[PDB]
Design a protein around this ligand. Structure first.
Ligand SMILES: *CC(=O)[C@H](C[C@@H]1CCCNC1=O)NC(=O)[C@H](CC(C)C)NC(=O)c1cc2c(OC)cccc2[nH]1
Ligand SMILES: *CC(=O)[C@H](C[C@@H]1CCCNC1=O)NC(=O)[C@H](CC(C)C)NC(=O)c1cc2c(OC)cccc2[nH]1
Lengths: 303, 306
């Protein structure tokens, strides 16, 4: 029993982390087979941060202008190319620890583990949720670019995030491993704003299930609602719409607890309208939405 | 910027996790050099679960009765001894992925990373605190026994916890890697209660410093207080007393922020007495106590491990 923000073990991703340096700019890269993936602005000089001409900066660079270090031993670069906002440095050695892996693009509402790195070395690992406005709420300092986010299924590592940026509001933005930003952001030394954020309704309900399973039950009531009427209350409080697929995905948790999804909706509606009035749920005084149904089942189901 | 509950990189430890089976019990073990460490109740049958006599159970076991699996590879057991609540099973192969390591026993209020495992397979990693009542509030299901907690101290993996038990209240209890329990607990199938818990004052202050470094400054005030006067209110709200040693440990963060420890002590007592009046700190509407002062320094200074 118990519930915590839980990352996937980072061992497989640790074995692919390297540093990449060009001039006085150092950041992290991911070494998979004989390719190192890193953000492309490693090739920028400070004199041209406002709108870098990447195409054109990259042709002026040679393989020897790049320093790649895997655990402080240098990896020789024998070719380089750009794909969207990521740089691909082909090196003379295949990473002997490359895991089975996939590059995937995640949907807002999904979670992944972040391995925060500096100078090619890991600092720590934590979980994040991709928000509806395509930002994440992480812990990243200068030098952390090229840190990756990931999930693990059996033996396969699905890389879904590569870190690039911290917005003026203090949240974080990045790309998939093909160089395409999540959200409308660009890799320029410029202040950019995110869309308005919303709460991930299906995740809040998954968390209420985790609470019930763990003994926290004071918010449950004797009522139910329809999907259409609940969504009217959800819109009113800046919550995402709850879909029929969201109802089916919560089926396992509904089956384990015996509480129907639409009954949990009625309890949430009450929580939205009346607040918590000083009570807590699973140790929190606010309604939490960075746990998916998958995250809850992985931890709370022996069943 | 930003501040999150962050576990240590779990790679060094993943490569040490194995499965141990004896009779009907499968649980996790720790494979370092040529020894596999695991909880001793793996030799137990369900009969006489209320107070097993482990000394006798072990003599009727042999090396061939212990099945150790490291992934697909079976490790031949060539010797076995019991040490407090752990079994030390000598195996015929030394783990080529043993890290630089230490066994240490931690104190209440210190934090560590837990690598939750089931049947030898790592499932997840999270951060936990040794509470003042020698429990941890973990996330453990059946089969998790033998999962370990650890810190990386500069370059050395210091194993400090091996999981054994879940109490009726839902919290968890375990041992050091020498087999001695944290708290007043025993490895027996019985309902056991823990002492009342308290809040770890020094860690809450460390978290207030983390908040400042990250821009939250509203709870700062111009009042002042003494440690004796602070402790008098701390006791009213169930906080551990703040000692001078605790004040010394907040020294580095006081320097980085330019806020003296006792002015932060004044800020915390106002918080306890008056609440946050709808406000939040590092996104939280409650006060956190599972970050040590070094946890704050590690994270806000980008400390790495290699
Ligand atoms: C490369 C790297 O590690 C940093 C990571 C940033 C740094 C600030 C602290 N947290 C963090 O995650 N990435 C960058 O510095 C970005 C480089 C771009 C070319 C991708 N820049 C920003 O993240 C950035 C720039 C900027 C700005 O322009 C002057 C105004 C306000 C905010 C802002 N953030
Ligand atoms: C060894 C193992 O894998 C589990 C881990 C426990 C199991 C329950 C779910 N979460 C968790 O952490 N540990 C055990 O089963 C313990 C074995 C002992 C010999 C150490 N026993 C308990 O955890 C336990 C037993 C028990 C009880 O016995 C009748 C009554 C009330 C509470 C209780 N906890």
């Amino acid at each position: 029993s118990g519930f915590r923000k839980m990352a996937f073990p980072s061992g497989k991703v640790e074995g692919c982390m390297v540093q990449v340096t060009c001039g006085t700019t150092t950041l992290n890269g991911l070494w998979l087979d004989d390719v190192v993936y890193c953000p492309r602005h490693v090739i920028c000089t400070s004199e041209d941060m406002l709108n870098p001409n990447y195409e054109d900066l990259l042709i002026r660079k040679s393989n020897h202008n790049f320093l790649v270090q895997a655990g402080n031993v240098q990896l020789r670069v024998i070719g380089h190319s750009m794909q969207n906002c990521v740089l691909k440095l082909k090196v003379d050695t295949a990473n002997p620890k490359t895991p089975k892996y996939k590059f995937v693009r995640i949907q807002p509402g999904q979670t992944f583990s972040v391995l925060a790195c500096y100078n090619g070395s890991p600092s720590g690992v934590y979980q994040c949720a991709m928000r509806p406005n395509f930002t994440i709420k992480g812990s990243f300092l200068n030098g952390s670019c090229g840190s990756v986010g990931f999930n693990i299924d059996y033996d396969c590592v699905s890389f879904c995030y590569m870190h690039h940026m911290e917005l003026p509001t203090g949240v974080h933005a990045g790309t998939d491993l093909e160089g395409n930003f999540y959200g409308p952001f660009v890799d320029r030394q410029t202040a950019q704003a995110a869309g308005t954020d919303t709460t991930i309704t299906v995740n809040v309900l998954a968390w209420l299930y985790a609470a019930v399973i763990n003994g926290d039950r004071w918010f449950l009531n004797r009522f139910t609602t329809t999907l259409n009427d609940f969504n009217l209350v959800a819109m009113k409080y800046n919550y995402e719409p709850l879909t029929q697929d969201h109802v089916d995905i919560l089926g396992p948790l509904s089956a384990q607890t015996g509480i129907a999804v639409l009954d949990m909706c009625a309890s949430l509606k009450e929580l939205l309208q009346n607040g918590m009035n000083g009570r807590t749920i699973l140790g929190s005084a606010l309604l939490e939405d960075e746990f998916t149904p998958f995250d809850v089942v992985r931890q709370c189901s022996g069943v």
